[PDB]
Known about the structure:
Distance between the termini of chain A: 56 Å
Helix content of chain A: 25-40%
Largest sheet of chain A: 9 strands, mixed
Number of helices of chain A: 17
Subunit structure (chains A, B, C): Homotetramer.
Oligomer: part of a larger assembly
GO cellular component, one term (chains A, B, C): cytosol
EC number (chains A, B, C): 6.3.4.2
GO molecular function (chains A, B, C): ATP binding; CTP synthase activity; identical protein binding; metal ion binding
InterPro entries (chains A, B, C): Class_I_gatase-like, CTP_synthase, CTP_synthase_N, GATASE, GATase1_CTP_Synthase, P-loop_NTPase
Shape of chain A: globular
Radius of gyration of chain A: 25 Å
Bound molecules: ligand 5ZL, adenosine-5'-diphosphate, magnesium ion
Number of strands of chain A: 23
Amino acid sequence: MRKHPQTATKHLFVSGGVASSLGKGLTASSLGQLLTARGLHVTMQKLDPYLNVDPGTMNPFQHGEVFVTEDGAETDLDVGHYERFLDRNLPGSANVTTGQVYSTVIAKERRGEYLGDTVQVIPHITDEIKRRILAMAQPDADGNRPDVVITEIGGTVGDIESQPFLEAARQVRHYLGREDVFFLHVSLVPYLAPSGELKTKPTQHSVAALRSIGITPDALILRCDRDVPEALKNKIALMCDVDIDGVISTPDAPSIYDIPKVLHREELDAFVVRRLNLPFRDVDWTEWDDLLRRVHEPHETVRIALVGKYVELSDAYLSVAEALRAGGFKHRAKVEICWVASDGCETTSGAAAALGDVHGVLIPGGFGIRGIEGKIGAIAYARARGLPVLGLCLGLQCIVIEAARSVGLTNANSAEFDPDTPDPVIATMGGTMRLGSYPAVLEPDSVVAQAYQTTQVSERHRHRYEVNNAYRDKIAESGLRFSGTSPDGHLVEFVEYPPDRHPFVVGTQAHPELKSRPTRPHPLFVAFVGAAIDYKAGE
Amino acid sequence: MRKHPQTATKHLFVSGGVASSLGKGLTASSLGQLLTARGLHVTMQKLDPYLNVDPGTMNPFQHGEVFVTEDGAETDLDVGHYERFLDRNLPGSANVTTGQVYSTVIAKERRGEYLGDTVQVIPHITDEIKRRILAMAQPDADGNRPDVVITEIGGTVGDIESQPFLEAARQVRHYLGREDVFFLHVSLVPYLAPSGELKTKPTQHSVAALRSIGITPDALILRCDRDVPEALKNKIALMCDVDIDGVISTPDAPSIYDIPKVLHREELDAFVVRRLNLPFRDVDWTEWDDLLRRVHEPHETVRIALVGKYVELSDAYLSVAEALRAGGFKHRAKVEICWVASDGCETTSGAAAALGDVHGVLIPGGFGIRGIEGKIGAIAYARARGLPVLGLCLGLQCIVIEAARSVGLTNANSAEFDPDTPDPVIATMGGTMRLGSYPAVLEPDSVVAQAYQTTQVSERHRHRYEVNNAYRDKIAESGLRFSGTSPDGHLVEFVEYPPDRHPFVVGTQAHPELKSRPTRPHPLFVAFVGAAIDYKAGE
Amino acid sequence: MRKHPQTATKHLFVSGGVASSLGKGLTASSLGQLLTARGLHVTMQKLDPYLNVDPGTMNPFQHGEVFVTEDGAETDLDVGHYERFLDRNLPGSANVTTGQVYSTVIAKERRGEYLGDTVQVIPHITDEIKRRILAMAQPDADGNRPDVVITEIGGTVGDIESQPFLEAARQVRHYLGREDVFFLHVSLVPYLAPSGELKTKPTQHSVAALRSIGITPDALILRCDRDVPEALKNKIALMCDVDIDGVISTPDAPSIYDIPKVLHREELDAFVVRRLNLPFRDVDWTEWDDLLRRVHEPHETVRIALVGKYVELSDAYLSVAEALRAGGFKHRAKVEICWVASDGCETTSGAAAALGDVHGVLIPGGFGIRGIEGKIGAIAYARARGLPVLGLCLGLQCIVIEAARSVGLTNANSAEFDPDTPDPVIATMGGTMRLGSYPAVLEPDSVVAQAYQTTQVSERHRHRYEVNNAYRDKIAESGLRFSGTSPDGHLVEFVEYPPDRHPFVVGTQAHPELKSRPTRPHPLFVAFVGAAIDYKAGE
Ligand SMILES: O=P(O)(O)Oc1cc[n+]([C@@H]2O[C@H](COP(=O)(O)OP(=O)(O)OP(=O)(O)O)[C@@H](O)[C@H]2O)c(O)n1
Ligand SMILES: O=P(O)(O)Oc1cc[n+]([C@@H]2O[C@H](COP(=O)(O)OP(=O)(O)OP(=O)(O)O)[C@@H](O)[C@H]2O)c(O)n1
Ligand SMILES: O=P(O)(O)Oc1cc[n+]([C@@H]2O[C@H](COP(=O)(O)OP(=O)(O)OP(=O)(O)O)[C@@H](O)[C@H]2O)c(O)n1
Ligand SMILES: Nc1ncnc2c1ncn2[C@@H]1O[C@H](COP(=O)(O)OP(=O)(O)O)[C@@H](O)[C@H]1O
Ligand SMILES: Nc1ncnc2c1ncn2[C@@H]1O[C@H](COP(=O)(O)OP(=O)(O)O)[C@@H](O)[C@H]1O
Ligand SMILES: Nc1ncnc2c1ncn2[C@@H]1O[C@H](COP(=O)(O)OP(=O)(O)O)[C@@H](O)[C@H]1O
Ligand SMILES: [Mg+2]
Ligand SMILES: [Mg+2]
Ligand SMILES: [Mg+2]
Ligand SMILES: [Mg+2]
Ligand SMILES: [Mg+2]
Ligand SMILES: [Mg+2]
């Protein structure tokens, strides 16, 4: 029945071999999704081997965009997959890093809390990591105790930085025994075109490296570009001392939302459930089948330009792209993304050449960014051409700078991008970095309010520059409305043109793509995709 | 001739295998001695793998006593060997730790100094360590540039914590090339009594472990309890790909001062000089030959009790024992040390049984100590019996408490050892921890002044409790003189009885054993050993 | 009850760390003895990592003397411990070697039996080793199925040559599971005299090396020169993730026969029995208590000289020394062995200086031996002095050469030792190497027959030179009797002098020390020790 006896909290560790970017986090999220559908209270955590105390200092070329929690922690991208697939808000405790662990242990040492012992990588660092891992098992604020904790070990097996985390996982397996701890290992099977053969040797060496630290994998996720032959799975099972049930072929799916279907088809969830002896029920595919219908059988299609610097073949905008696809799903339209370099849009002819074929433009945020002249040039061209535009954070800032350059403020800029500008229409109110959720109030019957269908919202923020309040009345002559603000009205949070000036041009300082889920699309992307569809139909 | 052309600074790394306490630091110090006598400007450094930012938090049962520098840093015991053999004062920079390196790199990360890169154990931590190693090569404050830098890598090859230091050493060998970097490896040759054979396998495994991280030893120091046969040295040389000139048999010498002779006899210094291509001259053995005469051919002998808690077969008092032996050397007397437990001296009969055969008693300092009732009991017994006493730090505190209990203050104690005492004759003036060298003024013609033959001295301090100034006039009725003080007189630094009360009973808050050298004995220990000699002769 | 249900055959693997000669084989034999006394049918096996197909080609300086089985295989020394402690005869299958495994697999490859596969170290070599290991579990020729198979893995963990055998053991643990496979790891705890501390770090590194190949030890045998403190055992248990019940202190016992008492006192056998879930009964100590009474409480003492080349501090004569001690036990006399170099006995004065204080002389066999002039010189001196002499194999040959030089044959020798001798009294009958058991017939009422109390015996042989039948009638004039022969009389097997010529001087071509057991002493050593006792009493 739906009510089951109590059992100990199961730990499921996901580790990666050969390389990073194998979809280890996505596989963990998909397994969490399956286990949730089978009725278990899944909770998730990631361990990051890098020494940065948080990725805010990093550059999006390293690991993609940053993410933000409701308690306001700044975390890795994978927490975004966990949210999007579990449809949950996760604590800042869900992202441990070597930086945090070492700082914590050094601080404890300075206070003498180890009573004069020599502080060592074993036991003290591994003890701190094991404590942080087992803390996830404690009852939540409402007494709901997770049935499975899925922990993703970042990096690659054999990296110097992963040694403490894998040792902590080994000690957890020792403490809790094999009946409670399951190891999932993700590995790459490359295809060599010249000889036309899939090679299993990288997987064998990765599993040998994993065995060399005392971990035996329970199952293998063979990442590949094509479905692995059965003979190769048999060879891997034989060579690696892994149950032939546990070798799971995981070819590159056309979209990330097919991965749960691939894993269920291969019966990974059944294998995990049997091996951990969890109580279960069959997966109710109703919701995700509707989602996959919206994916694979859309009624129409629309092209959207994504304008940025990191667009040079990188997943620096993953959350934005997924929120775009969710918006398409709400309208049952396929959204095709045209990756447009910002610097080709600095000249009006270059902007026309890049954008002229698209049906909409998106200006995402960023940090350490440069060359926003191209972004604003794309805004100018798009407004003249009539394309809808959505500007996120820096997109809003570029919209406001465009409006400044529309009314008299030709040399206007952000103090970030021209510290000597005579018209700093964007300025520090380094100022307070706004992070996390803040409330905002919206103009009644604003386009933003028409989208959200409410006067009150909350959004995740990450920025420190603001619209300079000295220029509101000047730039309003552009026609721009400050259609949403902080509750006191002190801070501008949203801007838009009236529908008769342009059918849809909106910007927000927040990152609404971090509240979107594929089964709960965000209002603004639904609105933007609807406007793009209306443009395509009317054009 | 004495003047030679310029050459690059040579780096000599000393590493250990099989176990710690192999005399790796003493071997490094002896090699520094020999290279100094050959005329080279040797400087020395230690790398500590533990995460403690400094050993002040540790307990003397871990790695022996703590040491203190003139700039006031708190460092490992090995810096004491470096001082005692080079007769130099070393900067706090001479002791790096993993704690310091990680704290530094994490701090630099929080400040964004890596410009958005991912902070990694390689390159960033190894770069910080390599920077800290090469900083030793820079010209000193007077422009004197070291000819050789001898770096001791603490721990054992294969400890998880040593991995960054050995990688930094490997990178230094890569950067500077083999003509500048020399690796000396110290290893253990155990003797198995049942089969009567020395075993080389531990050495082979240690050298293989060292090779597995990219280091090839240039020489081997074979630590043993007996001289290694030549056949075994040949076997080791063959198996380890080491020049047969580089296998150095280093049996346990009767005293640490014979080690330079052992290494010279084996021509280790000649091998190092040839391999590094250093300019040299023959060793002038005059000074050290005189020292070894004072060591091995004394005119008389005296027995001194060392009373403490750590005395249970541990080198927690190494500096004190060596300062005692240096005092004996100044008088050409052998000082034999009887290691006496403090807790056997709590009862007067037990104190008599322990001490009755000795010619003097020494009360050294300590931290985390307990049971000073036994220490004070030993003081009481010794004073009644007429034995000379020297009290260091806690020894002075126990002397003052004994005097308190001599004049009316029977329940008197330190606030450290009885927080509820009605007479806290020792109290916090946690208060300011006095660390390092401080100046002091002495009573003219005091026994302390008679020893030092001056009215002004400076001594290294490590303590935070002080004599309570409220009780000076009360305890002076014991006959105790506050014969040395801070220049303002606010702090008591030395106490003594007049010679007619007891021929010599003196205590000092400082650690004079940290300024002693075997070739420059400290005045107070010369005085104490002279008093013990006078007792033995008169008794 | 004595009759128990059937259970699967348990595998107990014994492995060594740090070094060889740790008593790993003796510990395995003692555990086998305890388990036998608890009523289980123990069988034993050794795996030798070296490539020699059998140790016959080796030199006794490598691993001591060679051993011989009843089916005539030539095996390592440890098979001798297994026999002496189990009182059993073991098959030649009880000694696998890398040489045999590789030769077997290469031969199978040449015959195409792998059907075209690539022959690899994994699986094929490890499969052959695992097959040879599991073959021990098969029912014997009479259907008695062993309850525990104790396999000793030769070498040291981390040797290149041990990698296939430890991998085979790991695969056995995988196939049979943890309930059937138990790992015992023997490790060294060295004592460092200069700092007066036992060091556990070698054990930690050895266990880490063992874990790096996927083996977790169940118990640790800490070999040491002194009883390990309890705090160190606790530290080892904590650091190594080993049950605190499983750390077994095993100090160097005064005799090998005390080891079963040490292991039982530490409750190793109880730990093994509990962990393997074996059915058991209490150990009946009656027999071994009688043996230890004969060991520790003898009525008298006698000194015996052992004359050989390998006597320079090596266990090259272990079986002979143990048979000597068993002979002493039969008479309840302590036998003290004086290790005498052969080459000091070449001169009559040197022989007198070496032997004059002893009560008997033993001349053991050997191969690759030289300098038998010294051995024969010792025989000449001993005969003149009246000391009893026992000559084994080469001892008999030297006796016969002495007799040759007693009757006219001054230049007589073996063709082995002077190929140009004019009187080859010892000659090839390279000839047939006699190996293993052969029957012999004895002269009735010969001293040999008086000892054995029978006319028919069987003994283990290892030699290829024989007494030249052409010289029997010549050398009989010495007084020597060919008191035992092959059944056809063709081969001389024993020689003796009549009791009135010398009270006891006997030689045999065989190695009776390989049929001796401490609880079943061999007749000839009982006789020889009785003669030595009679000499001591009468002298
Ligand atoms: O992505 P996740 O989910 O696994 O999260 C991850 C992925 C990777 N890492 C670590 O960053 C460093 C470089 O990573 P990296 O794989 O990129 O190596 P590299 O030098 O850049 O070579 P490459 O060209 O292959 O990228 C390594 O120490 C990694 O262990 C962390 O902490 N979290
Ligand atoms: O002495 P130095 O000059 O080399 O300075 C030293 C000596 C040792 N260490 C480190 O402390 C830990 C335990 O040391 P440790 O040898 O004592 O092992 P253990 O567990 O206690 O076994 P054991 O019984 O043999 O002592 C290890 O991580 C070492 O790397 C450091 O940083 N500097
Ligand atoms: O005795 P067992 O029962 O373990 O049976 C043994 C002992 C040792 N071995 C192997 O012989 C080689 C040298 O042995 P070895 O320990 O003596 O090293 P080495 O070079 O001589 O240095 P060391 O001075 O310490 O002797 C190694 O390959 C060992 O793995 C074998 O096959 N059986
Ligand atoms: N099985 C897959 N099929 C298709 N695309 C994929 C798959 N797995 C991952 N991806 C994509 O590859 C990128 C990297 O995957 P990711 O989850 O982030 O691995 P990791 O966290 O270890 O770095 C993701 O943006 C994801 O969308
Ligand atoms: N070659 C030696 N002969 C005799 N005693 C020794 C020798 N080397 C070292 N010792 C002693 O053994 C102890 C260990 O030496 P130590 O300097 O601490 O080496 P490490 O840095 O590894 O800890 C010291 O107390 C030292 O006095
Ligand atoms: N625990 C012990 N106490 C005393 N003597 C011992 C002990 N163990 C072994 N020995 C002796 O040391 C020698 C080597 O032991 P051994 O069994 O042969 O180890 P291994 O086979 O691994 O080489 C043996 O001759 C044995 O008599
Ligand atoms: Mg990634
Ligand atoms: Mg990368
Ligand atoms: Mg040390
Ligand atoms: Mg230690
Ligand atoms: Mg052996
Ligand atoms: Mg050997």
